[PDB]
Amino acid sequence: MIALIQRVSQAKVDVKGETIGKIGKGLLVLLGVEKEDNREKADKLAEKVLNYRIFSDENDKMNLNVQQAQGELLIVSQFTLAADTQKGLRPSFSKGASPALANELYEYFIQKCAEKLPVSTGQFAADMQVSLTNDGPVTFWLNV
Amino acid sequence: MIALIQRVSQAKVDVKGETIGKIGKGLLVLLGVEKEDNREKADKLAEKVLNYRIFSDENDKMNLNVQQAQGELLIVSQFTLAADTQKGLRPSFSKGASPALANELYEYFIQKCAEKLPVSTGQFAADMQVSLTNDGPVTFWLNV
């Protein structure tokens, strides 16, 4: 499972011209579900995202996690993170989870993160226009 | 070398409240320079980014590259892509290129991409607020 995170000052997800989810300071979490993922990997990835040292403390050191920083997570399903992009010019998805498993673990990861922090979401399998301001920018590819 | 690309309808880079680079349809390219990178890897990564099948054709199939799609690239230096994030909760940068090499290959990659397409940029080693609308969203981690 992959959580590609971007530190943001604000972000939102629009579907067909309407905003369906938004956050202020926090992380935009693009979530990629792979074959072999399970609730256990989700629990571990949620913990990693929630506690990753990505925010500035009162001295500008990247020392705080999103909880300490009083932020939110905007969680959006992104099947392309699981792509293999090594050869050629077209992505391959052999490691991608089926839509059923991906939606399940996506909604589950959301639940697990919500245990500790306010989170908002996109919509699974909907065309989304995801707007954000990556502050830094700061971007980390986390995975389990 | 890493090019984390996001398909956008628009994007911009602000530095201290002023927009220093912006694009319309295209790709926001977060660029991570690693130790061992060189002009040759840059040439290969620029080609990959420029020709990757990431845009929709007249039928909604992900068949066009950014050149065919008449887009631009917004290239922004991002040292965090080269981080190791496997253990613990704090990133490590053993594979990160020195600021000197990273700035060199960053400006070089920009030159190579400009040979084929209009490109705009952020500023190396400046705190940047990078705003964008990821259309899809569509996100690929490309590397060489």
From Swiss-Prot, chains A, B:
Recorded catalytic activity of this chain's protein: glycyl-tRNA(Ala) + H2O = tRNA(Ala) + glycine + H(+); a D-aminoacyl-tRNA + H2O = a tRNA + a D-alpha-amino acid + H(+)
Cellular component terms per the entry's GO annotation: cytoplasm
Keywords from the named record: Cytoplasm, Hydrolase, RNA-binding, tRNA-binding
Enzyme class: hydrolase
A Gene Ontology BP annotation from the UniProt entry: D-amino acid catabolic process
Annotated EC: 3.1.1.96
Any one Gene Ontology molecular-function term assigned to this protein's record: tRNA binding
Residue positions of motif Gly-cisPro motif, important for rejection of L-amino acids: 136-137
Sequence intervals crossing the membrane: none
Record's keyword annotation contains tRNA-binding: yes
InterPro entries: Daa-tRNA_deacyls_DTD (IPR003732), DTD-like_sf (IPR023509)
Compartments where found: Cytoplasm
Notes on the domains: A Gly-cisPro motif from one monomer fits into the active site of the other monomer to allow specific chiral rejection of L-amino acids.
Family from the record: Belongs to the DTD family.
Function: An aminoacyl-tRNA editing enzyme that deacylates mischarged D-aminoacyl-tRNAs. Also deacylates mischarged glycyl-tRNA(Ala), protecting cells against glycine mischarging by AlaRS. Acts via tRNA-based rather than protein-based catalysis; rejects L-amino acids rather than detecting D-amino acids in the active site. By recycling D-aminoacyl-tRNA to D-amino acids and free tRNA molecules, this enzyme counteracts the toxicity associated with the formation of D-aminoacyl-tRNA entities in vivo and helps enforce protein L-homochirality.
Subunit structure: Homodimer.
Name of the protein described by the UniProt record: D-aminoacyl-tRNA deacylase
Species for this entry: Haemophilus influenzae (strain ATCC 51907 / DSM 11121 / KW20 / Rd)
